[model samples]
Target chain A: CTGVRFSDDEGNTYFGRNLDWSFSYGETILVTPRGYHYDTVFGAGGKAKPNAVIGVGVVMADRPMYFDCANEHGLAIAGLNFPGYASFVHEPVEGTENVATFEFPLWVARNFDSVDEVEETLRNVTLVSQIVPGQQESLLHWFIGDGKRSIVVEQMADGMHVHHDDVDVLTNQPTFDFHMENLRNYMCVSNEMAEPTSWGKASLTAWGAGVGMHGIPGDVSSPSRFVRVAYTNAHYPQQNDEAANVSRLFHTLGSVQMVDGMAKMGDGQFERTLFTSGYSSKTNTYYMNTYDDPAIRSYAMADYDMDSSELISVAR
Target chain B: CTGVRFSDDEGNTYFGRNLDWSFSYGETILVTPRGYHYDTVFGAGGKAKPNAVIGVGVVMADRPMYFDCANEHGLAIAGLNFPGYASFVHEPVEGTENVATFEFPLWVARNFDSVDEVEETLRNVTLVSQIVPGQQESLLHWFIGDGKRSIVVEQMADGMHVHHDDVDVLTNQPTFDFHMENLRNYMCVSNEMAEPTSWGKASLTAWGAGVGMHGIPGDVSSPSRFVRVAYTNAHYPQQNDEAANVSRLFHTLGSVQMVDGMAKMGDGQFERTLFTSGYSSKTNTYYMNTYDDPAIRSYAMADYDMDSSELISVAR
Candidate 1:
């Protein structure tokens, strides 16, 4: 799936993603309040203190499992599938905050308020290979942003990493570095139709409007999605209205949506876009649309019981 | 400029385009009735009797200076910029239909009923350089489509050409053969995320969705837009519903839209998408939206006085 971050001139920041999978896990809009208890798979983690969050995901054994979410301080994080490149430690390392692969999202949500803090805390963090019973350890990487800045936390063979995200866009990939390096190939691309170019003795002038971006990728691959979403998000019109920004985010994410029959697994399962979600950290609201539906639904996180000691779950 | 043609299930055909330039020439929807008098640059050219035409263009000196148009027989034609590569005859060749560059669009529209016929007729048509009094000759190529087939007529230094349009997408610059030959480089691209690979013991796996199209171009250049629009139009879900197909056409065109400020000429003139249009041959309807407006307006070509003796003009 693809994820992106967009900011309006009015200081509103939005994070969005498309969740593509062969099946669903009864995902819903989950509200985990301040002081909500956690059943961390690694250890008996203490209750959340102040960074309450609401997001879209599934609840597993009474624990909040977030596909993506933003906390009270407007810090947002999303875990995208990272099968081949992600490598969590088989055993907990000494003197590190041992976080399980499944608990990474909520762990950060409960502990960090900004990417700056997460970047710092990751120095002592170890992604331990532990999963809930009946669940396999999922290889994944994360995108964390604190309204103004962002970073991708990818666990590689060496150790956990926090890479700077200048483009504010992410998709499935071999690695963040791979996608970033690929951008070098397209540095010559431009938004303007190219000026007249002479190929040998023939002056080849651009006859169309978009010739300036001659090398931009147009496929549905992770690298292609990374480039497409990055360029589109960079050029998408920005407005002060929250609704308009959300609309733009949805459209940008739509560029990478996997069409059902576009690809199929060797096991006969067809992977398609299951749902799309966007969260406005400034407003503490979440918006979403499902595969079969195009109409968007919105939820104001603050409208829920922010002080509740118990976790809450609601249908989308 | 960008142009495309799409087909729906059950024999419905659609063609669309975007007009991108620094400024417009007071263009409008102009209808040329059958038997309409001609102002051919080479000669009186007699009159248009059998094939009536309607499209968006400027009526220069009482002649239909068409930017694009379709005849009553459902044959559609659009002229896109081809400045550097297009070469016309300085003078008429003996025993050929010596049509001027400006009249080439209407000439094809009024005489041909399908791309097959146009492809055959192009053998004898020599595009001569001539323009309206206040206008300069625009180096251009033409995209002509009958409901089921399409061809791009590109005049080169050698002679006129009728290239097969397998992708049904047209953008400016270079030659049709150049774009077709360029497609060979992207033949390896797919819509599925790549399978795991071993990069010298470092297993490289896709971490997110959309990793399948790793090499697709993502820029705004003519070649990039040609690849992009071709891929999108190929995969766009096709339904028999006229409205659904029309909506798909607009969205596909939008993938290549030139945002204001995204491109600017050396002359301090910014080039962006001025307007986008789509026409359904089955319904004889035209739909369009301007740069400043997002709402769409449509016109039924058949709703007009098709039998009117004189030409008619209407605002968008």
Candidate 2:
């Protein structure tokens, strides 16, 4: 999965991502009202459900297992595959707010009003592993944005980390720091054409477009996707409207969108981008599209029941 | 100029290249018959203009100054810009076949038949810088190829060095060795899609294409162009017919063809692919196209004055 953040001229912040996997998990739009209560699986130190939440996820045992979601305060959180580098503690440790890995997104969304608040909670938070009857734990990392600034949350074997990134782009990785250091390899790259005017004896000229942007990787691996999305997020032309910013955000995600034949799975199934989604804090709306149907669909939080007695589910 | 060599199923040889610069030098088809003589420009130790030559270049000071050309015996030679790494001697060096840098392409074309023979001759070739009143010297390295094999020749300040290359693709650079060692950085890349099945908890699949090929550089810089062309030449489909092989060769060269806005010159002129050319040893013909006109134009050596005592030039 590749996730990125964008903010327009008027500070209409947007978060977008491409969920690439071999199959779907029967997930759909979920709306959790402010009155909804979550029985924390792990005995934790923090229990402060601050706002109503809306996102895409599946419900198992009456719980919303969010892939990504945002709250009424416009604080968005996305969980991307972290593979080999991500880890969790087997038992809850003292002096830290312990939460099950599956409940991380909702916990962050329900308790935080901004990324700053999320970081403060993260300082004492530990993701404890809890193996349910049939389901298993997933290797994952988190991306969070509060309509103004954002941070990446990673739980390595060592500990939980909150990252303040200049480039608001994230993909599955060896680590966020590894991707940050790897970016230096493309420091000389640009979105314009390149070559010296008086190169050697004869001046070399651009014969076509994208000459300067040639070194940007076009692959879909964790590192490759990271480089590609980083470049796209940094260079995509920005516009002011919610429509333009959402479109731009989706386009940036498209830079690393994996195709069916590009990534092969163990069962001979093809790994593809099942869906791409975006959330707009300015309009209090969420947008989404699937691989088969590319039409962008929007759902406003105001259109749903923010003060409902129970959870509301929208079938995709 | 980025040059590459290929041999199809029937062992039909091809040497393809893209010429990218701010402007053209008014070069055209040149047929130098066997009897053609070149007066040694720098008082060289060896004097030999062996075979009839066919190539694209201009005649300055009545000497055949070839950007790239070949002998009727199916031996090809290309001179690519070397920039800061290339250096020529001040005068004729003792115990060496000291040829002027401008006539180096023709000198090799006129002197030997196979890359093996060229390598033997290069052992004593000390390219001397003998600047004429109205002309200037160029920084260049050479690529020599026959129907079956090829080699790269670099004349750094240290000395003349010949490289028997596994990958015959050549672009301008720091040095042949630097590009060779730099290729290790992409040793993990491939043309096929990749990723593990059941990676972590969810199987990752490709949603698009070109996944394993993530790290391949796409720039027009010497190193970037080198990697791009090298990958293309290795992966391009092979064919049996002359037309198919020639088309494939041109397509490979097109992979690195610079567009107008790609590489900007100091004079503010855009560096563009002025022309793309391919030569077929099996058919004894040369194919070419320009930036404005992409139609592949051919000039058969058999149609020219191959036996002419004087130089024969064709207007393009």
Candidate 3:
């Protein structure tokens, strides 16, 4: 909801959306690690139903892991990206489910629950294009925030990817892959290595590149993202307050990956790109930094019930 | 520096830089606030080192603080966003002085010694912005940082100005004028006030006319941005290790603020704007966040010396 990026070669389109969804007086609200304010207009008949899943993601492959929304009750879902890699599976079988997954966002809006549930069930899941339903090839992902935790989902070239809950966070990488493929780069760029009083140089090098990833087998193919997220997840404080949780959500969003120029593409045609992003448990209060006008203000479904739209607008 | 918007009838033409340099480097560097990991190849050789001043009609503002730096000392500074009824004094006692107000990343690359130094010196000083050479009608504001602890000099509308130091937070919201005018909003929007054990009668309001502003001043602006960075600053563990500090720096950059979309422009038309952000240290490492891409990605300058030409690349 904070920021979005898009690129198109054939058509000159500025791919950006100031997200908006009206919330009726009740549904389910799952606050994150640092909930700044706890109030959800989405509830059944204006009352919240916990144990439900809510999150955002982008589907680059079979199952879109737009952000997902899940609760202790086992309701899991995600929103995958649209356009770029919209494919999905028809059944719960792996590999055989050669369906075009929408961006992860749409997946969260229409899929299953729990990391294990998504991991295991998606093996047979399939995606049928409801292009006109939300929009024709729209780029979107989702938020999966339940009563207890939240996670981000994305389908990259690798496969269905899921980042288990770790405070309130966001994702901003291409395909949502490789959180730490850039670790070596960061380590080599360390500021302390040049320090005079710094500790063991040889040991430091061993620790920097080798020992750091020792027990944690670096899955080169899917290693960086998993490793980076693991570190963030392990370090994130576990909490239930909505305000604090919202802060955590943005923190995660802030942590999402973004590349400066077209280093991977081997050209300078593309400026920037983001797979997808979402917030969990945090209130849906967001504004565009570029536009200063007031009408453009918005809130995510986290502010209301998925079943109703009346609660969309809040007071301040 | 997109299109400027003051009173449309007689609007001001904000200055802009046409970043004409291209830089790239094959290097690995360590940065601060390793909540996330960020890497880069030095791009062209031009950084703006934006140093300008804007005269305001208000006084001291309570800005969220950040400490920024650079290996180069030619340019670096941080901008503080705070709420308060601030008006730069119509004039300065010492007469007009043209100065450069370094944006987030630039400030980090050119100022201060440590986070503590930034905090200490920032405590009392009035930022001065001289009228630009050609734009005399433009007001004045000040920014001072040298790839280290930077200084903020603000002039209140009442002719009283103050400099701040020793702060770790900064979010959207003009200097401090609005802060004074907006404390009630912070009180109202914070999730800390929520009481789950109550009927709707005693429940807190989710969205109201600026009601959200009362508790979360950052809510109306960029709630997500504030949440993301605040989470890092408040929750990141205390560390002095250089390698780990580098990790935190990249992570924070991963989670730092950038320009975003606006739902409704209070005024109306949907125009895009840009926001610059930075980060600094409390002890281990003072971090910096910038809105520019290459300028922000420059790590070697942290150890070397760079100038405005090497730091800022204003969009042509």
Candidate 4:
């Protein structure tokens, strides 16, 4: 599962996320430049096509699959685990660009510079199934954002649905729209102090200042996290500088961060937040902080050779 | 503004709690011995009464208030802040013993050794209004527990309600019964892994093993805290010794404990969990832990002079 956040001010656009899972993927940050070629696993028959793209993000395994990325353009994207409602195709469609679900994020980061381009490109692509030989089918949804706006792409049995995300926050499972609809359950939630209401002859004041936010779901479920992150992101105090803004983003993510051993897996292991990463489109930089080493760490495209063909690994 | 839990087993009865408030009360643990005279603030015109009782609990101010305590007879009681529905008499009753609301916990802890005696005594006592000169009228409900059973005593406009608490968790607000009824909203809560359910052609499994407890409240409000502490307390693994049991109890409390800055009071000061305390009937020990210094500190009744006249304070 995962959580993602984005912020927009003048020219400064920022993205933050928490990656949570029961097991580690041995992930490392990888910087890939414009001159690199990548292949998309397509259809059940395992057809492949090569494409060139420019971006940087965390990758896993010897195959170096990218699950999250920000392109040279002011655009960012992340594929958070989405099960239950997630559906994919095993066969290719006649007149559309067919690509396996595993290759979806890198394909978008490589091809599009903005959410508008991602939306247009999505119109011609059919997400067909191509499971890795020994790996589990990647059940996922994506949060793709440009500096101006963000959208959620969810693939279901009917087809892909691109939802315009006014909240600019995303978590795993359930549909994005379902979480949006779940907002009604918390209509009473507010940042302001609750007013006194009458009960018979008594004017009952709030028990405390927080009674106003009485119904905000406090659980770690995806739908609950979606509501909490959305509320916190909307109400967070705006900071003046890039550093302060980045700190604020991490704080919002931390509000929903999970602790180890709190959520047990079926096998008795616990699901926990492994790492949190943030990207600032305006600064052309990416930040990462892990559960063990909570110090904020960053890397800038300005510090890298953008024309390099080899994928570079940064220190954890 | 609090939560309390208890465990029942042969030769082992443990209790734990979290003390939450918007402001500091400079609370310290106080041990009161039997055969000591205590005054009960009563009615619009304050009245004094003498009672002999044996117990230890956290106290605040010069009045030596008992916010929580466990008697020498394996009975534990705590008074958590309860607004909205809390109501008391302003005058003496014709046939009932009168006591001020703030003195209720001490009255129960001092007069009775078991919940059965407390229940019988409660039938004859009128909780009267006698707010201290500069303090707010303490509106509260209580959790009263013996090793075998626990109950919630709430006083409202309708009079005192003695609810047999099967869940054995208590926090602030609406009413004890309201929280009990609200538990229906979380009927799906469980510690076991949720089995995969079919959705049309898809076999949709849980996003993770903890989807069983998907809706357990994670917020710091009274109702949410009520649900969260209840869930955690009920599911905590059984321990072999009192030390391990005490550790498990604190872990459950920590699940719902609030950070200082996360919640704000009306005056801009943050509401926080000031301290947590636990009582062991088997050991006759009172344990205290504060948010800043989280080490478990304990004081045993066996180590104290239980027949002393003056109240004794234990170092935090």
Candidate 5:
């Protein structure tokens, strides 16, 4: 599961996400370059367009592939757990590009330079589920955004459904539409304090502080996490600088981040946040923090060779 | 507006409360000794039964009185804000010991040593709305607990009601019964992660961890705070000693402590937690943390002169 967010400061846009799982993936961060051609598991014969992007990647059977990353034009992409609702059973059409679900993110990152471009191409492609010999099939939905606009992509039984909204929170299990509908339960939520309503002869004022957000969900499920993170991202104080903005983003993520023992899998192992990472489109710097190292660490694309042919590992 | 909880560690019980108000009370901790005669506004000239207790107190005019306290025998009492549903409009009964609502906490704190004793005496007492010369009538419900049991005392339009329960959580406004009924909304709450439930062809596991607590209220209103605090207190880890127990208590209170500006009064002031305090019944130490001073500070009743007639101020 994951919790992801996007924020804008000045002209700079930032993206953040949490990687939560019951078991460690033994994953290390890889910085992929612009010319890398990813081998799509479901692709019949097509090749990725030569576009440059830089961000985090995970190694599977000695191959590093990007599940989350951003392009040189400031577009970012993330694939969060979107179980039950995600469907990838479609067969390839004669002329359309068909990519496996696991390879879709790198395909998107290496081929598109903007959210607009990504959305346009997404209309022509199909995603399929093909088991890889050494990799587990991850159920996920994709989030693509630029500095100004964002959209959620979910592959449902009815086909690919795309939603565009101002809310930038994403979690797992229930579909994006389900979470959007669940938000009706919290329409009464507000950042302002509730006023004293008249009750009989009494001038019944609010009993304490925070009466405005009275019904916001406080649990750790994907649905409730979406609400809390959405509310928090919307109401967080607007900061003036990039550093302060980054701090605000981390604090926002921290509100919904889970601890080890708080969320246990059926097998008795714990689901914990392995790392939280954020990216800045303005500076092209990717910031990350592990569970053990809370200090925000940064890797600017400007400092690395985006054209490097060899996959680069992020130094811990 | 606030969330308060009681928990036990080993043989000792601890009480913790968050004080949320639109304006600062400029409240100082007060420790009063035995033989201190309190003048109840509705006492009808009857004297308060003498007893020793120590806790947080607010000053009205020249009088310092407790809104929360723990007695010598490990019994603790707290009066939380309870607007709309609180009623104190009865006329003084000629033969009954009538006490004004604002003066009730210390009255109970000074007269009882256990929840059972408090419940027994509450049977004959009448809470009234007689205006004291210098104090405003505060609408509130009281909580009394000892090492083993706890009960809530609410005075409503119908009459005073006493509720007994294993859940030791209390908040403001809506009556205890209202909160109890509201618990049904969160019947799915649990400490364990929800197991994977089958969904058609999918072994659909929870989207994320903490499925058990999926819908627990996350807001700061009396209702949501009650649910969040209740669930947290029930699920908080068992600590080994008073120090660890105190830390756990603060963590529980932190979950519901109101941030300034999040809750506002109609008059435009922001409500905030002026202070959070915890008391250990076994050691008779009242611990406090002000908004400005987050480091926990302590005051032991055994270290003070419990026989002094002068009200002792908690040194910052």
Candidate 6:
């Protein structure tokens, strides 16, 4: 969709995928609780102008359809697509209705602070579909994050699916179910590769290689992709440094980018064009860049006022 | 590979796997820092005896080669048949080594404690050969308990592979890779089964019947075999009492039992002839049983000071 750049304190740099394939990067703008208008006046049921944390995001929707973004409160949400193979149980329950697609994230943004709260509320909302055009189905999956934690919610054909069981790392492919089923096959996969000991069969010579494993298939090989992501992110140098985290995010996003013709929809139409990438710091500033241009834009919260001007040709 | 029984002040319980199949009650065990053992003989180098948690496992290892208790410390090390799937990676820093087939549970029992540790250590240990007579490969894989939280690690003839990116549960399958790759075809998955939301032309109603899907392919179906194990085990009731935990372990394992003529080996011989099961109640005492006569006959622990003679009956 779009491309973005990030540089570390040491000047090491990386690029990554910006947004889904339907919009331009600069369309992304910063708005706060003070003076903001809803992207669409469709239904007034959703929440508005969240003041929790500084927010940076892409708005392709008259409704909301974003892969991810961080808020002033430090909460972030990323959209996900878990195709077939995953089915979370939808128990017989009532009061599960009337959740509009775009309104979901807005609801999340306006309310909730911790993973626990979000998880609790999830049980109540029943995903209802008032179909949107272009999208084959409802643009229905998400990954939410706070600086300290992250969670994913998938609205499948069956019901709402949530994932936080391990940590906040997800890859495209298999429905969440298959992903869960596949866990039975791996003996050990680490965030960082371990050193081989002189013990019985474990060795340094063939580290990271165990038996009975067949690599994942598909344009999005979830398992292999996950291993790579988990390994890279787990060993990433960012730790608690805000700048480092931004750089790391950009770098990872860059690794999975599919440009122009790559992300075209089924009918040979590029329904989505990429926007830019956004990063949030421990500070109030939210940094982002448009793929169409080399300029870097930033939004910062300063009490009653926000730094209105965007930063161009920014620093690492 | 084995069976186990447990007894305490509450009551007694029995469990065991039947041949090449097993199952869990869909719950995980957590061992907090207070109970973690540090500075013991298990220490490899650091003084940090990090908090360790063990997953209760139901497994059939390497046909008849291996299958038993496991723990996920850092690096995963399974115990499976090392027949033909292993070859060492000749890294610049390490030499060629023998690689053998590994199993899921054993991998956890032998290696690092956490996903981070496994990642740190995996880069160093090269797999060599397995103990299977001249077979040279380990046909086993493991569903790890970190990163995607739950993952399957498999070593095949080509190389070691990983499957699943975001699941916290797992079960048996055709191969680790197949399960990982299968995610692409199954896009109509859901978190709950009560309601059916559809993707593509598939209406939520079309697949609504598949909701809360406890089994895939549905138990009698090919894929359902693994799905059944995954769902039933994961949905098991969480209990702090050892009696209840063991009871649930066996009850869930009953769902995935591999009866006679259910599984085969490379030589087409009946590799496994018994059943094994284990239960952990957030404690070191991991009770086990081997169901040769439908009686919980054995008990052991990799970390607990348990004795086989103390084995108890489920009814008593």
Q: Chain B TM-score of all predictions, in order?
A: 0.91, 0.93, 0.40, 0.89, 0.90, 0.53
Question: What CA root-mean-square deviation does each model show from the true structure?
Answer: 6.2, 19.3, 23.4, 9.1, 8.0, 20.3
Model 3, B178-280: lDDT tens digits are: 3333443332332122233556667543211111112221111333333333333333444444434334344333433221221223232221222222222
lDDT values, one for every candidate: 0.76, 0.78, 0.29, 0.71, 0.71, 0.42
Query: What lDDT tens digits, residue by residue, belong to model 4 across residues B132-209?
Result: 688677788888887777888888999889888888788888887788899889887766667888989899776664
Model 6 lDDT tens row, A7-65:
34432222233455444333444343423444433332344434443344444533334
How many angstroms is the interface RMSD of candidate 3?
A: 22.4
Model 4 C-alpha lDDT per residue in residues A1-316, reported as the tens digit of each score: 4555555556566776888876767777777765554445553222132223323344554334666777677677888888767899888888688876766767776667778877887888898767678966778888888777888989998889989998889998788878899977876677666677898999866667566666776666677788877877776655557776776676677667665445676677656667788788768888887655455777887787776667777773
lDDT of 3: 0.29
lDDT of candidate 1 over B5-72, digit per residue (tens): 87876666688899988787788877887767666677524334658787888876777888888877
- Candidate 5 docking: what grade? acceptable
Question: Candidate order by TM-score, highest to lowest?
Answer: 1, 5, 4, 2, 6, 3
Best by lDDT: 2
Candidate ranking (lDDT, best to worst): 2, 1, 5, 4, 6, 3
Off by over 4 Å in 5: A1-188, A192-215, A236-263, A267-316, B34-52, B89-92, B132-136, B199-203, B260-265, B268-270, B290-294
Task: Identify the candidate with maximal TM-score.
Answer: 1
Q: What tens digits encode model 6's per-residue C-alpha lDDT throughout B1-316?
A: 2122222333222222333534322222222122333221122333233223233333222111224433422222223222233243332223422223332243334445545555444444344433447643334444344212334455555665654323233344456444333432222222344443222111223233333342144323224444454445444544557556667667765666556566565566544334444534244343434445556532333443222212111212
Show model 1 residue runs off by greater than 4 Å. Answer: A6-10, A18-66, A70-73, A87-113, A117-137, A156-159, A180-218, A227-316, B19-74, B87-113, B116-135, B155-159, B185-216, B227-276, B281-316
DockQ agreement of candidate 1 with the native complex = 0.25
lDDT of 4 at B66: 75
Q: What would the per-residue lDDT of candidate 5 be over residues A48-139, giving only the tens digit for each residue?
A: 44555566667775455665777666777888877667877746766667877766766776666777777887787888877668966677
* Root-mean-square deviation of candidate 2: 19.3
Worst 10 residues of 3 chain B by lDDT: B1-10
Candidate 6 stretches greater than 4 Å from native: A1-26, A35-67, A82-97, A132-137, A180-223, A259-276, A290-297, A303-316, B1-316
Q: Across the candidates, what are chain A's individual TM-scores?
A: 0.91, 0.94, 0.39, 0.89, 0.89, 0.64
lDDT of 5 at A256: 70
Worst 10 residues of 5 chain B by lDDT: B42-51
Error of 3 at A133 (Å): 39
